[PDB]
Design a protein around this ligand. Structure first.
Ligand code: ZN
Ligand code: ZN
Length: 186
């Protein structure tokens, strides 16, 4: 059987195929930062084939980090790389070096732009010290709207209501044996 995933507003979501080794590959690549209690992020890049998305490239962008944040600092090299290799942005991945697997306030704000651009966009959060991981998205439309309208100050400000959820597997995301390459732009 095939599961057809839909948003909370009833819009169809195209399947994203995620190489099943990507999470482990990401952890091993960013390991030095993880030991120093610094987050690292990566971009999930790939292509649309027939009517489904395939993540084929794990791109580690030029970035800045703390124990609680990470973010791209040179969009240019990232942009030019994706343009040159004809890659779509399908989501992003990051670590919580010591904490549990959840989406923080800043994570929700980060993810909003991804999911506005691509309704299927996903956020993978790795919590290596807990040996846990999760794949998340905002509720659409309700969670997206909450974050879009939010102008509250502070990196850790709370939000009212349910805003995010785990993605449907295997309907929205399915982990499979497939090709992958790492591109470290640092
Ligand atoms: Zn986070
Ligand atoms: Zn907010």
């Amino acid at each position: 059987f095939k599961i057809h995933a839909y948003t909370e507003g009833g819009k169809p979501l195209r399947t994203i195929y995620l190489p099943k080794l990507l999470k482990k590959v990401f952890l091993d690549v960013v390991k030095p930062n993880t030991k120093k209690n610094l987050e690292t992020c990566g971009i999930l890049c790939g292509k649309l084939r027939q009517n489904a998305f395939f993540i084929t490239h794990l791109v580690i962008p030029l970035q800045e980090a703390t124990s609680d944040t990470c973010g791209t600092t040179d969009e240019a090299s990232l942009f030019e790389f994706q343009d040159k290799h004809n890659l779509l942005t399908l989501g992003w991945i990051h670590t919580h070096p010591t904490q549990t697997c959840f989406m923080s306030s800043v994570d929700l704000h980060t993810h909003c732009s991804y999911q506005l651009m691509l309704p299927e966009a996903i956020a993978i959060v790795m919590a290596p010290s807990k040996n846990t991981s999760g794949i998340f998205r905002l509720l659409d439309p309700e969670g997206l709207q909450t974050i879009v309208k939010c102008r509250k100050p502070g990196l850790f400000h709370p939000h009212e209501g349910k805003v995010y959820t785990m993605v449907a597997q295997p309907g929205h995301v399915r982990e499979i044996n497939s090709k992958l390459q790492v591109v470290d732009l640092r």
